[PDB]
Amino acid sequence: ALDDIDRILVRELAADGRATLSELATRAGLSVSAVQSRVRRLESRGVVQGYSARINPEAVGHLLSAFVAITPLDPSQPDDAPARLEHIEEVESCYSVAGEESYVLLVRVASARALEDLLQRIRTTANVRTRSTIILNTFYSDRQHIP
Amino acid sequence: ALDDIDRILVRELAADGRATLSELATRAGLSVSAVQSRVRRLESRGVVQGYSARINPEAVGHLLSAFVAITPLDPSQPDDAPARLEHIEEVESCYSVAGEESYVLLVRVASARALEDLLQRIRTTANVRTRSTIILNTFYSDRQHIP
């Protein structure tokens, strides 16, 4: 239940999250009221989860990023790694994954030594072994596709 | 230098990219003309890179996400895989990495069947071998942290 109009709306809003209701109304052939109300239904049905500025991580002092794959030191202990790691602010994302590892994290940090301290924090807070893959360059990211 | 009132602004806009320049000014303690001019300057030094609505991928038909680690088949050839894959819309992100593979992609697709098709297209269009790690669930993503 996403009609043609809604796909247009989410496509425009993925490319430009600050687009005004009136720019959107003219692209969709709707009134500004019609647009607001379709946008409110997109948000409350959880199709649109929120809006963010895309911040350049380097510009704010995050000069090093990494994938960290984690696996429980004790797989019989309950499985709450994501909730435990939620209070660690340098953890930007957490996915559960098929394979030998349990979770993959994306982590951002100021430097190599800051990474070594963060890995210790991640091993003790989730009781986990870590396998780190350092990112050397981001060619493009977050390019959301609406088919 | 990021004039740490500037840190309040990026912090606020990362959390709510549809914040208004006036509902901002009160939260930061400035005047619409200052707020507006910083934001335009932040956008000009590529600190804020865009604004986007965060779309739920499964709401839109992408019921299968995967990391796809790729490595060029022939190292005598120019390594231009990111440029070559850029036109493939199901690739959301591309990173070079220090690990076992040369690059990691984040890919989104309708089904396991559609992934197999996509992996064939990736192999033939960029001349790479692939290795996919299927995501089961996303616990949180894109929590941009501003120190």
Ligand SMILES: N[C@@H](Cc1ccccc1)C(=O)O
């Ligand atoms: N990696 C496990 C799935 C899993 C993820 C996270 C926690 C526990 C299990 C598998 O391939 O079956």
